[PDB]
Structure prediction request, 1186 residues.
Amino acid sequence: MIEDEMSREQIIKDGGNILVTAGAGSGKTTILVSKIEADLKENKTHYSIAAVTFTNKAAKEIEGRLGYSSRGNFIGTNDGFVESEIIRPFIKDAFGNDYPDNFTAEYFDNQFASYDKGLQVLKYQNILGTYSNPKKNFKFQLALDILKKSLVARQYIFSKYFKIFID
Amino acid sequence: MKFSNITIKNFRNFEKVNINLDNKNVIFGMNDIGKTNFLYALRFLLDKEIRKFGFNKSDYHKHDTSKKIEIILTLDLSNYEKDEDTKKLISVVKGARTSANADVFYIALESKYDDKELYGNIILKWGSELDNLIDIPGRGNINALDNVFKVIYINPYSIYNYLAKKKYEDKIVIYLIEEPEISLHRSMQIALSKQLFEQSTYKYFFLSTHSPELLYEMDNTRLIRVHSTEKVVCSSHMYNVEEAYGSVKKKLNKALSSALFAERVLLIEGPSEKILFEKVLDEVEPEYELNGGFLLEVGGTYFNHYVCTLNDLGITHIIKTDNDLKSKKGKKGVYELLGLNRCLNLLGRENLDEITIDIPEDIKGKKKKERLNERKKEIFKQYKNEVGEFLGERIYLSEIDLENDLYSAIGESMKRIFENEDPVHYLQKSKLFNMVELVNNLSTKDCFDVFEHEKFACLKELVGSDRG
Amino acid sequence: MKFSNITIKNFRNFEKVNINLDNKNVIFGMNDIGKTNFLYALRFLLDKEIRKFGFNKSDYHKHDTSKKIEIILTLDLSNYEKDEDTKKLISVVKGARTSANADVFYIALESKYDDKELYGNIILKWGSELDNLIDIPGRGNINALDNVFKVIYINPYSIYNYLAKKKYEDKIVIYLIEEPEISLHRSMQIALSKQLFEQSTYKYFFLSTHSPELLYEMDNTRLIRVHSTEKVVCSSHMYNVEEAYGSVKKKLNKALSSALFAERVLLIEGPSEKILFEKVLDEVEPEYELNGGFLLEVGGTYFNHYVCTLNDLGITHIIKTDNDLKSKKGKKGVYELLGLNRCLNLLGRENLDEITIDIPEDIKGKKKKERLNERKKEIFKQYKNEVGEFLGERIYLSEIDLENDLYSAIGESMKRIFENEDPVHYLQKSKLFNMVELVNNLSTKDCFDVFEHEKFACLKELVGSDRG
Amino acid sequence: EVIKYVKNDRYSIYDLAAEIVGNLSSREIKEIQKIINELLVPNINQVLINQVLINLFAKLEITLDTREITAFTEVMMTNEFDI
Prediction:
């Protein structure tokens, strides 16, 4: 019984926004895949979920504990989520057709530090990189600008995803 | 949320057919090959199990083999903020749309023959623009349209109710019911019509029928009619019953259901007209229902529903009526031109003003009749040009009544078999029994004088023989 | 020349059924298993290709296997000196007859299970006596009955016309047409009905239908109806139209064809009664045609054809009418009781004497109406016991008319929505438009007062719910 | 091709795209579509010179003009050469 089982019984049967302040390790993947399995079991609609991490080793571990599904769930890192769900399908709609679709993410030689020259690089030579300062994100700023600028990105990202799991 | 139209640009017998659609579509007509090819075109567009076999040489028109097969379907995609299947399409379509065309979506199918391996490949495209349609992505044997749609083909009912109740919440379900009246008693066809048109389980379907009893509760439905010609020409009408005509909707549908499967429909008011016209057509043209003729009962519903339904589907409508006057409620001496307003309504005009006639009390048993008939005579005289405009259409308005025009065709025969000074006065006392007594005693060559008269050209247009 | 009856003493679902036959037999009903088993019993009796397989365990009732299957068919054999098929039977039957029974022939089939080889053997006998039937002789795989009869089974028309014209002069040809209306447009069903019932190529047939349009020219036919119960009970009527009812035969058949596929038929006169009754039944019992109810239009044909047709087949018939008076031709002041004679005719009585009423000239616009109404009142008063005898049947006779009985059920509602001193007088001026105006303004709970009233028990018998 | 796309009303942008040098131009035809959609204003006085100038800067094959820009100008002068 005790704290483990009563916290599991509370957290599994919730339906709202949840904030979990855990300890060091001890199987965060276990509670994550248990809540994901419970949410996918209780849902019979067409909506899917999105699990977000940093290292894709955790992503293959999550889908290994999960199994196989064709509902359309997204398991991976947040860079891949922003790239494949917000930036790539709607870059031609949010900022005009003259901005290009097919592009390569490379953050190994890039150290530019402005938004203006950043989307100049994305328009002219179609490379998306990173900011110079470590505490920034050009990709997430561009995703926020796409979401605020494009209607159909809001329609897609509301009509597909039901819950978003942040770790 | 709602389908818009389908354009078939090459198929087994379609040259270039653009059929407007809706939810709850019902197709009917004379040739069954065109209807089953319409349903097979829908199956080739939306069903995976039929699309995987591809096209043969016989799926092209005239086996011509050098023409591209194109089938395009349009959706509305506009009614958002309340609808669930809109999200069901948007979540899978992903970034194939533009924010300028937030509404209106296109799904298309293309095919071109190979002529070396003898195989017609089927390529599916989608997009919100008429051009620049991109291919539908898919990994193996399936694509995204298989994740969107679920097609149920029913060919020989309550199980699908609870099946859609607890399952198929993931996908938009489209029914294709092909001839459900085969080996069904007519009470079951009426129940099936009630289930199809009132219950909300059947949201999108494409029906094909040969029975009038399975269209008895038609509302918010798209009526689609294929013609009797060899080349497929298709007509379409958006049928819904107005709320003012809601108390008598059942008896409107019970007549229009039999009227839809005809080719020349003549609209009459009472059953005495029915008795006289079947007696005449028994001797003159004994087969007329074989050739597509039909006699329709209206009985006081302004002709506006029936003519608007029959004109859009390409069915010729002939109207014969009389200009009677109706007394207003609680007011003596004022009358309404009922027949003239009824004929002027469907061309589209304003209703005529209320006409008063000064009639003293005295006696009103018999003299009031001709006191109204000469008023009808001068009313018919003053509107001669509108009567000619009616005769430009198939509207035939009598001078006084049917029986007065019957006396002007045969008078001596009716005088002989009635034995009265005025046989018309004996005809309008008991309209049911005296007409039966007339047609029981009316011999041959009395019908032919009725047929070949100027006031009975409605029967000549119903028969439809082009002698001249 | 003519078939007499078939007795099925054991089959797949027949316990002991004795169906009277004729030439041109048409069977219909609710359960399809009984109709297809009737046609399969005829095929087992007369067709060689079905008889050669024998019976299985499932061809006995309840799979009981210990009961002998017996199927007997009777012929008339009397109409000689002019008929050709009589000689066609006599020449092959040879010395299986007696001179005492020169007419009436029997063909019988017997079967008993073996219970060791699991096979039911079929033995055929014939003879003119009920007992002492001898076996039909035959050399190899055939017998003499194969030389007599030729059976054509048609299951999904003009080819068989010239096929019977230049061939099949050797053998008596029997058709078994099973459901010919499947995937046929209704004009083709009307043409098929004309071919079946007027053209003399089809002499003997056994039809089974689910469509009213293929019985439109019914004459000299045997109507056979299977019931809706699980145990097969069968009703039979010899339908032919009398020569006096020959001018209006088409509109008689066009109503009786839809009336045959019902279970409770209510007979009314005019379309105003139709409008009022579907308006009431829309709110009270919204499904009635789904449960087997039907409203029939008569319109002045003495109720004698319809009741005699519906009573023999086991269909309940309810009649509601009024006692109106009809003026004679050329004689002032003499009247005929029309409704009373029409109700007294079908129980079987003499027509009542012509009743005269002394009415002075004066005015006849409005006082003549009430001057006929209290005479109708005293006529209804003096025949109270015959009215009770009518109520013993399903005949309901109004005191004056429908609208006067409607005013006695709801008066204040009609006074409110009509705005007149007498609403009944406004109702009988324009009977079509004013009834529509009534039912358009007649709300809910006005229908329930019509339903629960004593003069409207016909609707309660049409619904048929056994509350008491 | 550009005058046929401008003065007809319905001629497609890809029909004009099908002649520029080596073609295979995707995602960049809207860049010139904006410029020539700015040519759909009538403005008959002097805007054709600098609009065609920035068009030929966009589409290359530069300095093939001066006489040819006037030969192109005289077509739409009076708004129609042959109605």
Remarks:
- Chain C is about 35% helix and 20% strand.
- Chain C touches chain B through 61 residues (CB under 8 Å).
- Residues 7 and 18 of chain C are 4 Å apart (CA to CA).
- The radius of gyration of chain C is 28 Å.
